[PDB]
Design a protein around this ligand. Sequence first.
Ligand code: RLV
Length: 126
Amino acid sequence: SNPPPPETSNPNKPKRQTNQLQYLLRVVLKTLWKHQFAWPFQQPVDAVKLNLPDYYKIIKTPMDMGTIKKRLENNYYWNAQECIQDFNTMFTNCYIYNKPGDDIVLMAEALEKLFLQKINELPTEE
Ligand SMILES: CCCNS(=O)(=O)c1ccc([C@H]2CC(=O)N(C)C2)cc1
């Protein structure tokens, strides 16, 4: 079985709209979402379909871009750092589970470089 996917909605959570969060959805997420290497990261890892029975034994903090997208659409993040941390958990999860040179790792590394550049270009907090 798969675990429940991470929380993406929480009506009682602290909520605000900021120019850096708008940028993270409009620029960072969407730039990564259209990438030719995005598809394995666009939804939670399905350990049943992929026959990875050990995945959720090793990965205890799952994360993916589908969850990030929904968290941004739902204003779930209070600041850019909370969003950035989820991206970094997605990347590191992939490097922990897999091995250097694996196709899935090469894909994550392409996305990570783009992400890093987009965070360098974060607009000034307004
Ligand atoms: C380029 C490799 C494609 N092979 S695959 O059988 O479709 C496939 C295998 C494994 C995954 C998981 C593993 C992982 O760490 N993820 C973010 C996703 C996803 C897809």
